[PDB]
Design a protein around this ligand. Structure first.
Ligand code: NAD
Ligand code: F8U
Length: 313
């Protein structure tokens, strides 16, 4: 438990979970939401305050999570940083890279920790693969497929789904995109319901990333290819398999050993929030800062522009 005054700005569906975590691991002053009823129920459930304004929240805390709609991230984070308050912003960072540039600048001027909520970085399989030190993968192939739900029309297939694997790509490789091509399929509306991007980075890595909001059953998978290894990750079922050239148990693939990696299930959002607060308190680097958030944001905008161009021809 960290000794820190914390708050959440925006306590809808996911903001409430942020608030639960902060209440468990820090001194949660309370919450603010534009819908007063909703803040009031969140505060009643967590036994914190429901604040009458964002400013009165900010007066009583050192750090906040910002879990408001993406188009509001800039204005809210601007107010929060003007008050010298550190910020964990839910992904995606902002709507465009100029807002992200401005908040990075204001954060540096204020000597504030700026973290973006890119939860997939703290997934147990990704942590294990980073600690294995395999180097930059040469090829990544990923699928993020979500069933159509009443709210799916507000799911941006690139900015809300694919951005996870775009970010993972940029992190595991440490490289920058040189070429982005993409296709999209729009069934319900003019907006893509599924998209697939083919990204070439400046170290020669290729990422082949699919996302959909209209599938039957969920699917969250990533296959990763190095020169001497193959990693298969089921994010949903929390499983990891690593193949190397070996001693013969794998059917249909000769001369390879499949190592089933024993992954522990942990609370990802609790992990991300503890990391944010430790970064403030120890001055150590946070799991995903503003710079990385903007990197993936620029890539995702490239993908989306390509997708909308495909769909419009
Ligand atoms: O992501 P989700 O899945 O949590 O989506 P969501 O819409 O469930 O949660 C969004 C929350 O943000 C709140 N909100 C919107 N604009 C705000 C603002 N300017 N300041 C504070 N709160 C604001 C909404 O009232 C809602 O509670
Ligand atoms: O089980 S795995 O996760 O190892 C791969 C899948 O079986 C297959 O759908 C895709 S692949 O094997 O051709 O890359």
């Amino acid at each position: 438990m960290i000794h820190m005054r914390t708050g959440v700005i925006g306590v809808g569906h996911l903001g409430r979970f942020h608030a639960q975590k902060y209440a468990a691991i820090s001194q949660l002053a309370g919450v603010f939401d534009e819908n007063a009823e909703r803040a009031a129920e969140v505060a009643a459930e967590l036994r914190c305050r429901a604040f009458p304004s964002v400013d009165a929240l900010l007066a009583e805390v050192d750090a906040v999570s910002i879990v408001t709609p993406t188009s509001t991230h800039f204005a809210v984070a601007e107010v929060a940083m003007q008050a010298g308050v550190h910020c964990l912003i839910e992904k995606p960072f902002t709507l465009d890279t100029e807002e992200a540039d401005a908040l990075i600048g204001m954060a540096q001027e204020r000597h504030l920790v700026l973290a973006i909520g890119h939860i997939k970085r703290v997934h147990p399989a990704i942590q294990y693969l980073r600690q294995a030190g395999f180097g930059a993968p040469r090829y990544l192939e990923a699928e993020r497929l979500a069933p159509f739900k009443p709210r799916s029309l507000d799911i941006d297939v690139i900015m809300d789904l694919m951005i996870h694997d775009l970010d993972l790509t940029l992190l595991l490789t440490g490289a920058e995109p040189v070429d982005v091509r993409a296709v999209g399929v729009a069934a319900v509306t003019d907006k893509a319901d599924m998209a697939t991007a083919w990204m070439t980075l400046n170290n020669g890595t290729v990422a082949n990333l699919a996302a959909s909001r209209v599938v039957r059953e969920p699917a969250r998978r990533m296959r990763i290819f190095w020169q001497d290894r193959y990693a298969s990750v089921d994010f949903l079922n929390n499983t990891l398999h690593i193949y190397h050239r070996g001693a013969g148990t794998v059917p249909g693939i000769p001369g390879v050993r499949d190592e089933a990696v024993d992954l522990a299930k942990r609370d990802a959002l609790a992990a991300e929030i503890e990391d944010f607060l430790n970064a403030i308190a120890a001055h150590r680097p946070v799991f995903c800062d503003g710079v990385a958030g903007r990197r993936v944001l620029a890539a995702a905008l490239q993908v989306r522009v390509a997708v909308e161009a495909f769909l419009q021809r």
